[PDB]
């Protein structure tokens, strides 16, 4: 169908808070193979972030029930099977996003800002796979997340200002990856504190962009105080 109709459907899906529809429209925009403008890339990401986010959050509630039900075997089985159905959707969605990234988005990216945004995405989606990873894949998945992040982060440090939201958002997520997935609060703190100081030191920016950057810096500070007890 027509790219621009698909994009309009994505925006209507978004106003309706129907993120699965929204993702399906943006996915098929992507699959026509032309590079996405910013707006479109934002719609794609917003859609899939909500789709995967509803499942991660459901996965958490149910995993946690499954843990509390050891070892009432029949109840635990109910929770575990439901957990697996959720995980089944979570993996399919991560796989889809990761395949889009590899076939279309990262290949087509013609500016640094896009490259970084998409490699950050790749880190994020491998990270969501890691959150629920079966012991025998976990290692490969975690390596895939950390390399995508690390690659995004190197490009952003050479190509974008320390106060750019994309680069800060990436420092936030990469540092959460180190805490939550790699269990290195050290690494996580030094990453976050580093990005936060670099942005302060630059700090110039306008009144709106000044907010976005501040909001993300607030998240970095918040995690920092948290993680240092």
């Amino acid at each position: 169908m027509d790219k621009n109709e698909l994009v309009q459907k994505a925006k209507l899906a978004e106003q309706a808070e129907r993120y699965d529809d929204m993702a399906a429209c943006m996915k098929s925009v992507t699959e026509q193979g032309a590079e996405l403008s910013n707006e479109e890339r934002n719609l794609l990401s917003v859609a899939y972030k909500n789709v995967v986010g509803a499942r991660r959050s459901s996965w958490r509630v149910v995993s946690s029930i499954e843990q509390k039900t050891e070892g009432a075997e029949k109840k635990q089985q109910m929770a575990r099977e439901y957990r697996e159905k959720i995980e089944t959707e979570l993996r399919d969605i991560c796989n889809d996003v990761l395949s889009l990234l590899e076939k279309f988005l990262i290949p087509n990216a013609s500016q640094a800002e896009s490259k970084v945004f998409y490699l950050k995405m790749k880190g994020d989606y491998y990270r969501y796979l890691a959150e629920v990873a079966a012991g025998d894949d976990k290692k490969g998945i975690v390596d895939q997340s950390q390399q995508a992040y690390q690659e995004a982060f190197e490009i952003s440090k050479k190509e974008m200002q320390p106060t750019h939201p994309i680069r800060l958002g990436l420092a936030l997520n990469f540092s959460v990856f180190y805490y939550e997935i790699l269990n290195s609060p050290e690494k996580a703190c030094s990453l976050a504190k580093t990005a936060f100081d670099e942005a302060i030191a630059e700090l110039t920016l306008s009144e709106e962009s000044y907010k976005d950057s501040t909001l993300i810096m607030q998240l970095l500070r918040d995690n920092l105080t948290l993680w240092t007890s």
Binding site: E39, R41, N42, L43, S45, V46, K49, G53, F117, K120, M121, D124, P165, I166, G169, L172, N173, V176, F177, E208, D212, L215, I216, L219, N223
Partner: peptide, 11 residues
């Protein structure tokens, strides 16, 4: 804004 939301920020 659109961009903040699109960045899928961790907590």
């Amino acid at each position: 804004q659109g961009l903040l939301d699109a960045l899928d920020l961790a907590s």
